[PDB]
A paper describes a structure:
The oncogenic MET mutation Y1235D, which is described for different cancer types such as hereditary papillary renal carcinoma and advanced head and neck squamous cell carcinoma, leads to constitutive kinase activation presumably by destabilizing the autoinhibited KD conformation. Recombinant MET Y1235D protein was obtained from insect cells expression in the nonphosphorylated form as confirmed by MS analysis. The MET Y1235D mutant revealed nearly identical SPR results and thermal stability shifts for tepotinib as observed for the WT 2P form and Y1234E/Y1235E mutant. The biochemical potency for tepotinib against the Y1235D mutant was identical to the WT protein and in good agreement with the SPR KD value. Again, some parts of the A-loop were disordered (residues 1236–1243), but electron density for Y1230 indicated identical π–stacking interactions to tepotinib as in the WT structure. Surprisingly, we observed a frame shift in the A-loop of the Y1235D structure involving Y1234, which adopts the position of Y1235 in the WT structure. Consequently, D1235 in the Y1235D structure is shifted toward the position of S1236 in the WT structure, which is solvent exposed. Again, the partly incomplete A-loop electron density indicates higher protein flexibility in this region of the Y1235D structure in line with the observed lower residence time and melting temperature (Tm) shift for tepotinib. Our biophysical and structural data are corroborated with FCCS target engagement studies indicating reduced kinetic stability of the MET Y1235D•tepotinib complex, whereas the WT receptor complex was persistent over more than 72 h.
Author numbering: 1066 to 1113, 1120 to 1148, 1152 to 1235, 1244 to 1345
Write the structure that this text describes.
Amino acid sequence: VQHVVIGPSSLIVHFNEVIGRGHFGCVYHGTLLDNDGKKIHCAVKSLNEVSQFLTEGIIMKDFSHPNVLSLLGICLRSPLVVLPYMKHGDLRNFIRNETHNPTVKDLIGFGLQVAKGMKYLASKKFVHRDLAARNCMLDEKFTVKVADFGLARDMYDKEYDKLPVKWMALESLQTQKFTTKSDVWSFGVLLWELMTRGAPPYPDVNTFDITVYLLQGRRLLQPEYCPDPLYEVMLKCWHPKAEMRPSFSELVSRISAIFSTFI
Ligand SMILES: CN1CCC(COc2cnc(-c3cccc(Cn4nc(-c5cccc(C#N)c5)ccc4=O)c3)nc2)CC1
């Protein structure tokens, strides 16, 4: 924690500007100062046991990838988690917004960015457990950051019942076993959210019903603007046998090929 401590004098937290709400606390717009006096935009996560949470999440300072959320630091005083501000907020609200019009290629490009971030996390043997479009952020350059892990972990939406059962693999619903292969299943649902522009998966299925539903021989339907090879990728992500699901390295390779076919 020593190398990532932020002095309370160097942090301005705007408690009036709430930009996110979670069960553990709120996200606020903040301001950090650099050695030269330049203001850096923050997202300050509040935390309301605490030592255990910081112990579990301090591994995030060692992660560094352009598609993975980084940690700016921790302000000790209840501790505050300092994260980089993500101008366009969460990926799900972005694709449901009406100020921007992402093309089918842009949506596939967002999925490819997530797959690159996940490929990095899987190479570090890190299992996300809650991969979903609501849990990825978009910065000022429209770069996707896989977020909601370590110190940033929280439930930021009401899509839990708490577990995100509609994004969970069949073996995780049955035995509560989470692996990189169950993150590949969640990644499939995330591609489907991207291709439907943020539609809720299985809308007429109650969260308690999902296991029986999947076991009947059912999967999410192909969205109307989803290319066939991308729907095949989603179907491979949802393979009933975890070991038969593509790796994130294979997903990056395959999705980059599909992305390249669009003008
Ligand atoms: C209209 N609105 C005004 C504010 C604008 C900027 O808002 C921002 C909101 N949040 C951050 C931020 C950055 C780094 C880390 C986190 C923590 N974190 N939060 C979420 C999160 C936040 C809000 C809603 C939902 C959901 N569902 C999910 C997911 C994963 C995660 O790790 C938050 N930055 C900017 C966007 C447009």
